[PDB]
Amino acid sequence: SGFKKLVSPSSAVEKCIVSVSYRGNNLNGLWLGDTIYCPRHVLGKFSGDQWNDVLNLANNHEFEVTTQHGVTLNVVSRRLKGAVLILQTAVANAETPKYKFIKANCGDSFTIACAYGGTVVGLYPVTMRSNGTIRASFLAGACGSVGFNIEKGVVNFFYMHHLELPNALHTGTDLMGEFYGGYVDEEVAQRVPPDNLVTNNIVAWLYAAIISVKESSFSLPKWLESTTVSVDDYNKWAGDNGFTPFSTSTAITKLSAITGVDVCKLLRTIMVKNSQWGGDPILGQYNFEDELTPESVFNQIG
Amino acid sequence: SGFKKLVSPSSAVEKCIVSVSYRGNNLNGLWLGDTIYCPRHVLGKFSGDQWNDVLNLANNHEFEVTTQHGVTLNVVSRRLKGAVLILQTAVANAETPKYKFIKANCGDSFTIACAYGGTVVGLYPVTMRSNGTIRASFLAGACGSVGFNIEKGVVNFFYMHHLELPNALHTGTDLMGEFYGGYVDEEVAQRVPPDNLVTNNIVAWLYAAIISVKESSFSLPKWLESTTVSVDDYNKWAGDNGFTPFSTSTAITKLSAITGVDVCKLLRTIMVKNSQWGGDPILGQYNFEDELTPESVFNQIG
Numbered sequence: 135s136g137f138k139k140l141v142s143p144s145s146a147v148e149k150c151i152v153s154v155s156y157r158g159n160n161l162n163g164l165w166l167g168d169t170i171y172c173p174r175h176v177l178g179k180f181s182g183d184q185w186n187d188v189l190n191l192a193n194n195h196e197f198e199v200t201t202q203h204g205v206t207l208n209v210v211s212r213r214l215k216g217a218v219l220i221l222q223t224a225v226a227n228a229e230t231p232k233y234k235f236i237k238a239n240c241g242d243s244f245t246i247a248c249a250y251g252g253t254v255v256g257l258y259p260v261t262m263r264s265n266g267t268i269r270a271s272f273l274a275g276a277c278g279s280v281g282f283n284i285e286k287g288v289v290n291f292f293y294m295h296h297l298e299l300p301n302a303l304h305t306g307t308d309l310m311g312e313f314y315g316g317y318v319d320e321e322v323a324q325r326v327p328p329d330n331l332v333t334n335n336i337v338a339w340l341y342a343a344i345i346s347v348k349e350s351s352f353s354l355p356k357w358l359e360s361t362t363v364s365v366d367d368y369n370k371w372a373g374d375n376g377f378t379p380f381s382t383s384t385a386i387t388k389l390s391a392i393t394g395v396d397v398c399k400l401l402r403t404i405m406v407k408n409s410q411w412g413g414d415p416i417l418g419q420y421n422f423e424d425e426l427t428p429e430s431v432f433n434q435i436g
Numbered sequence: 437s438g439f440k441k442l443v444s445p446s447s448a449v450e451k452c453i454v455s456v457s458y459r460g461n462n463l464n465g466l467w468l469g470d471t472i473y474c475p476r477h478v479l480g481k482f483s484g485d486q487w488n489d490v491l492n493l494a495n496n497h498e499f500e501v502t503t504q505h506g507v508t509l510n511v512v513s514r515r516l517k518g519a520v521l522i523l524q525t526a527v528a529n530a531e532t533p534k535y536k537f538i539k540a541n542c543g544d545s546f547t548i549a550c551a552y553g554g555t556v557v558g559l560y561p562v563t564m565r566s567n568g569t570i571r572a573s574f575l576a577g578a579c580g581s582v583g584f585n586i587e588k589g590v591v592n593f594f595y596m597h598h599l600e601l602p603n604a605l606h607t608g609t610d611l612m613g614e615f616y617g618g619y620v621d622e623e624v625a626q627r628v629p630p631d632n633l634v635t636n637n638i639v640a641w642l643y644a645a646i647i648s649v650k651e652s653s654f655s656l657p658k659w660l661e662s663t664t665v666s667v668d669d670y671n672k673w674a675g676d677n678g679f680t681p682f683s684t685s686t687a688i689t690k691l692s693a694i695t696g697v698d699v700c701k702l703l704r705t706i707m708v709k710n711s712q713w714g715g716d717p718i719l720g721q722y723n724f725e726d727e728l729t730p731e732s733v734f735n736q737i738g
């Protein structure tokens with residue numbers, strides 16, 4: 135019993151994180167096969183069409199790349215792909231895991247390996263927000279940190295960190311070099327669209343709250359609405375109230391079955407609680423938790 | 437910028453987690469040098485003075501110990517230390533880190549390496565609560581999972597998982613075999629004292645919020661009380677209102693000096709917001725976060 139936001143174990147990723155520095159700019163890279171992926175602003179703070187000329191003038195021998203075992207790696211080629219710099223090394227990483235480069239969708243949760251100087255210093259879970267940001271924890275030096283999970287023995291790489299926006303919002307690229315949310319790696323004002331609370335994850339959390347209450351009180355929570363709202367009617371309301379649309383999933387179907395509570399009561403609960411939460415907390419809170427996924431809640435049922 | 441509840445990276449610990457089974461009981465062990473530490477109920481569900489006779493009846497050849505890579509280990513001796521079974525292996529773990537066994541005090545926070553079948557499947561942070569429990573996420577098979585952190589290249593082990601109490605509360609031993617909270621490894625009703633909100637960690641979270649509001653709005657937070665309360669006055673109030681006592685620490689002093697905000701203004705804020713929070717959130721919430729430590733907040737400013 136108990137529900138937590140889980141982080142993936144980090145050993146396979148630690149074996150791929152390296153330090154990449156260039157003329158005083160210190161970042162991190164992801165070393166897979168004979169290729170290092172790292173943010174292109176290791177070269178400096180350029181914009182637009184300046185990047186290809188910067189790339190052509192750069193020199194491989196000035197990339198200072200070190201492994202966590204203190205081996206120096208040697209760059210033999212360089213290219214840009216989107217906002218990611220791709221550096222080829224003279225020898226391959228013999229500890230390359232099975233992996234895939236996947237784009238995270240809104241509401242998908244994954245683990246950040248927060249790295250400084252080529253060393254992972256801590257991990258934490260994040261959710262890709264509707265507007266292409268994550269709420270993370272990064273300082274100067276953390277760029278190149280990656281977001282990942284592990285599924286069926288494969289490391290999925292979702293994210294490489296580039297940029298901190300106002301209000302402690304973070305963004306970056308996938309491992310293809312494409313920025314989430316259409317941001318850019320420039321120190322200029324950038325529009326950030328409103329964050330929409332992730333309905334499917336809130337639904338998971340309400341089900342976790344019901345399981346908690348039932349497993350140790352056999353009595354449905356007082357805050358749970360008995361009235362229902364249809365999905366299309368909730369989704370109409372969601373578009374006007376800053377929530378993502380509800381969409382069915384295998385995990386949500388199972389959680390509704392396991393608890394015996396109609397998801398349409400949970401949606402009506404979202405609508406009521408959002409308008410006026412009142413004095414009844416849900417798992418101790420008076421605000422919605424939307425970074426715990428239905429799959430994670432399911433996996434924590436025994 | 438941004439604040440998260442961080443998890444330690446797990447590679448050093450993954451190299452020490454093994455599976456330990458005995459006559460159908462399947463749990464995990466921690467393999468350091470030539471010694472495996474695991475919960476003594478791998479031998480079965482006994483009580484009181486029975487454990488010594490059970491230990492004497494056990495036979496080393498019937499322990500099934502396997503490493504994550506599938507290597508079978510051979511037990512050559514056995515002894516009890518509190519509720520921990522200590523098994524000696526014929527060969528030492530060549531991947532043993534530098535480590536310490538430390539007992540966590542109330543408010544101390546650390547990482548759970550959640551393991552099934554000898555394999556770490558996920559990590560998450562926890563805080564040692566005032567009643568000697570942690571609020572974790574465990575299923576059958578998880579016993580022997582360990583709580584740890586890493587400081588200055590040394591793995592501190594704080595916790596080994598044994599038992600789930602009512603209301604999804606978890607507890608277990610330190611690596612010396614002593615149960616937290618005076619619980620026992622028996623499937624009986626046990627006395628669980630109140631879980632008091634952890635003042636020192638709430639103070640950390642309020643400094644985090646102060647830091648965030650300074651960075652976002654160039655002002656003190658609207659919710660921050662201007663009056664101070666003395667520590668002695670606060671601590672009398674805490675004992676009547678389900679809070680732990682405040683106590684100074686190096687990290688809290690550093691946060692007070694960095695922000696320029698007297699910690700006694702934070703203590704007054706706790707008293708006021710606990711009695712009537714109102715509609716102003718703190719870092720998005722209307723309830724106290726008490727599992728982010730002063731040390732972690734300090735580390736996330738640099």
Ligand SMILES: *C(=O)[C@H](C[C@@H]1CCNC1=O)NC(=O)[C@H](CC(C)C)NC(=O)[C@@H](NC(=O)C(F)(F)F)C(C)(C)C
Nearest residue numbers: 175179272273274277296297298299319320321322437
């Ligand atoms: C990695 O090099 C850092 C990580 C940042 C530093 C503070 N927290 C982080 O996550 N990235 C940068 O310093 C980045 C460099 C660009 C050239 C891509 N700059 C920023 O993130 C800046 N942000 C912006 O200017 C903004 F997004 F437009 F707001 C700051 C001001 C340095 C945070």
Ligand SMILES: *C(=O)[C@H](C[C@@H]1CCNC1=O)NC(=O)[C@H](CC(C)C)NC(=O)[C@@H](NC(=O)C(F)(F)F)C(C)(C)C
Nearest residue numbers: 135477481574575576579598599600601602621623624
């Ligand atoms: C590891 O072997 C499990 C971990 C448990 C399983 C469910 N979630 C957990 O964290 N521990 C046990 O099964 C343990 C064995 C004892 C002999 C130490 N038993 C329990 O945790 C039981 N708890 C109790 O009887 C209680 F604490 F008194 F409440 C349950 C009922 C199996 C959870």
